[PDB]
Design a protein around this motif. Structure first.
Motif, PDB file in Angstrom:
ATOM      1  N   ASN A 292      10.461   6.033   3.113  1.00  0.00           N
ATOM      2  CA  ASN A 292      10.135   7.386   3.622  1.00  0.00           C
ATOM      3  C   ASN A 292      10.147   8.430   2.493  1.00  0.00           C
ATOM      4  O   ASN A 292       9.299   9.283   2.516  1.00  0.00           O
ATOM      5  N   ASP A 293      11.081   8.319   1.542  1.00  0.00           N
ATOM      6  CA  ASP A 293      11.254   9.222   0.370  1.00  0.00           C
ATOM      7  C   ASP A 293      10.189   8.968  -0.712  1.00  0.00           C
ATOM      8  O   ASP A 293      10.319   9.594  -1.755  1.00  0.00           O
ATOM      9  N   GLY A 294       9.407   7.889  -0.597  1.00  0.00           N
ATOM     10  CA  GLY A 294       8.403   7.538  -1.617  1.00  0.00           C
ATOM     11  C   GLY A 294       8.734   6.338  -2.488  1.00  0.00           C
ATOM     12  O   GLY A 294       7.830   5.866  -3.158  1.00  0.00           O
ATOM     13  N   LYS A 295       9.977   5.858  -2.486  1.00  0.00           N
ATOM     14  CA  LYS A 295      10.305   4.774  -3.408  1.00  0.00           C
ATOM     15  C   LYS A 295       9.497   3.521  -3.031  1.00  0.00           C
ATOM     16  O   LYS A 295       9.353   3.168  -1.859  1.00  0.00           O
TER      17      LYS A 295
ATOM     18  N   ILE B  43      13.181  -5.256  -6.079  1.00  0.00           N
ATOM     19  CA  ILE B  43      12.977  -4.346  -7.215  1.00  0.00           C
ATOM     20  C   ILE B  43      12.397  -3.054  -6.655  1.00  0.00           C
ATOM     21  O   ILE B  43      11.704  -3.036  -5.622  1.00  0.00           O
ATOM     22  N   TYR B  44      12.694  -1.957  -7.355  1.00  0.00           N
ATOM     23  CA  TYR B  44      12.262  -0.644  -6.881  1.00  0.00           C
ATOM     24  C   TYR B  44      11.728   0.190  -8.020  1.00  0.00           C
ATOM     25  O   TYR B  44      12.063  -0.002  -9.205  1.00  0.00           O
ATOM     26  N   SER B  45      10.886   1.164  -7.662  1.00  0.00           N
ATOM     27  CA  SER B  45      10.199   2.011  -8.654  1.00  0.00           C
ATOM     28  C   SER B  45       9.735   3.301  -8.001  1.00  0.00           C
ATOM     29  O   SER B  45       9.419   3.330  -6.811  1.00  0.00           O
TER      30      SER B  45
ATOM     31  N   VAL C 197       0.857  -1.169   0.000  1.00  0.00           N
ATOM     32  CA  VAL C 197       0.000   0.000   0.000  1.00  0.00           C
ATOM     33  C   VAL C 197       0.900   1.228   0.000  1.00  0.00           C
ATOM     34  O   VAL C 197       1.847   1.300   0.800  1.00  0.00           O
ATOM     35  N   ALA C 198       0.642   2.157  -0.909  1.00  0.00           N
ATOM     36  CA  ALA C 198       1.555   3.288  -1.116  1.00  0.00           C
ATOM     37  C   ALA C 198       0.788   4.477  -1.659  1.00  0.00           C
ATOM     38  O   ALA C 198      -0.252   4.330  -2.279  1.00  0.00           O
TER      39      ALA C 198
END
Length: 379
Positions: free
Chosen positions: A182-185, A207-209, A102-103
């Motif tokens: 914390n930065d949104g990634k 993996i990151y986005s 959840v983001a």
């Protein structure tokens, strides 16, 4: 309190055309559920994903990804299929092993869910190491931006980044939940089966986005162990917590996935005994400190029954560990047992800590919020 999310041999789903899915449970119900993943929104809505293993507990079987949604704090659930398998093979087509996040993705509250997909492979994924990647495999991503009511496929570059790596036969999420930093990634923990020429069969990574569409793999790998894993954010580190036969393993990366080193506050702190089991690991704030909450099985019979699914607190400063609640103090079904997923939020001034877990082919839910003072004090 305690509620049944998905009842073994007690659910009936419909396919995309609205025709019932006749499973092998009594009355044509779905036979067995496995591999729960839970994400709670800013509205307090709980969404629980699980494999709907319509015919059998086996992982090599006909499987869709079910989703259950509760807006009353986990008392009642509205159920549906979120992701359908491709319906190539009535015995083997499957989408499986969810991991959710959840983001707020550029402001937009989103539930992401990622599952592996196979069709004709009759064996477990570790059997297929000859190709980069396996032609039968894919890793698909679905989203909801309407608070879990509807899910739609996300077109990604995940298959492409695996192909361009060239050393990965297949990849899955780490099972349970990923995270938004914390930065949104956006970060999904991952597990991978390497191509045959690589000495280590399994590795862990992530993996990151930024947008949920374009993803990246870091250049490094963490040792695989039993590969199911979750990541937490702690200072400028990402820290994993990995399934292993015996003592669970935990590593940290201070260079965003270039290198990993043991993380002493969690490494080898919880024993899951023979074979290991998936476990869920999350952080909970306590002032401007953090505590890790963790769930996995004590496994008192030292086997695949994976008894006594338990909640632990890890003191991330001192390395102390303690048992908070043996919330499923039962011997599991060795056909497939032991998995869990935690979810914490503070919405307004209301803190919630929920768990879902495997219970004799069903998925159960408990509200563990009464334990928050004990967990929070463990710093």
């Amino acid at each position: 309190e305690k509620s049944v999310v998905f009842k073994a041999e007690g659910e009936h789903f419909t396919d995309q055309k609205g025709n019932t899915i006749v499973g092998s449970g009594s009355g044509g119900t779905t036979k067995y559920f496995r591999i729960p993943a839970m994400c709670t929104t800013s509205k307090g809505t709980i969404v629980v994903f699980a494999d709907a293993r319509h015919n059998t507990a086996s992982g090599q079987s006909f499987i869709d990804t079910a989703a259950a949604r509760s807006t009353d704090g986990g008392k009642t659930w509205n159920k549906k299929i979120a992701i359908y398998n491709d319906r190539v093979n009535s015995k083997l087509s499957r989408v499986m092993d969810p991991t959710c996040i959840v983001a707020n993705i550029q402001g937009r509250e989103t539930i992401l869910v990622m599952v592996g997909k196979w069709n004709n492979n009759d064996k477990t994924w570790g059997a297929y190491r000859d190709k980069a990647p396996d032609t039968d495999w894919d890793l698909v991503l679905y989203k909801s931006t309407d608070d879990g009511v509807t899910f739609s496929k996300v077109e990604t570059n995940i298959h492409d980044i695996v192909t361009k790596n060239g050393t990965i036969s297949a990849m899955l999420g780490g099972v349970g939940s990923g995270l938004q930093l914390n930065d949104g990634k956006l970060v999904f923990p991952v597990q991978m089966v390497r191509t045959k020429n690589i000495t280590t069969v399994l590795n862990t990574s992530f993996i990151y986005s930024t947008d949920g569409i374009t993803w990246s793999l870091p250049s490094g790998y963490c040792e695989g162990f039993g590969s199911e894993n979750n990541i937490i954010e702690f200072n400028a580190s990402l820290v994993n917590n990995i399934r292993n036969s015996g003592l669970r393993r935990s590593f940290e990366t201070k260079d965003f996935g270039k290198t990993w080193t043991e993380f002493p506050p969690m490494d080898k702190k919880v024993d899951n005994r023979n074979h290991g089991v998936q476990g869920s690991t999350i952080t909970i704030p306590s002032g401007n400190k953090l505590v890790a909450a963790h769930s996995s099985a004590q496994n008192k019979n030292n086997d695949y029954t994976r008894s006594d699914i338990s909640l632990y607190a890890h003191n991330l400063y001192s390395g102390e560990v303690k048992l908070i609640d043996d919330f499923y103090p039962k011997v599991g079904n060795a056909s497939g047992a032991g998995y869990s997923c935690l979810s914490y939020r503070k919405n307004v001034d209301k803190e919630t800590l929920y768990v879902v877990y495997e219970a004799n082919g069903s998925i159960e839910f408990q509200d563990l919020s009464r334990h928050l003072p004990v967990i929070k004090s463990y710093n």
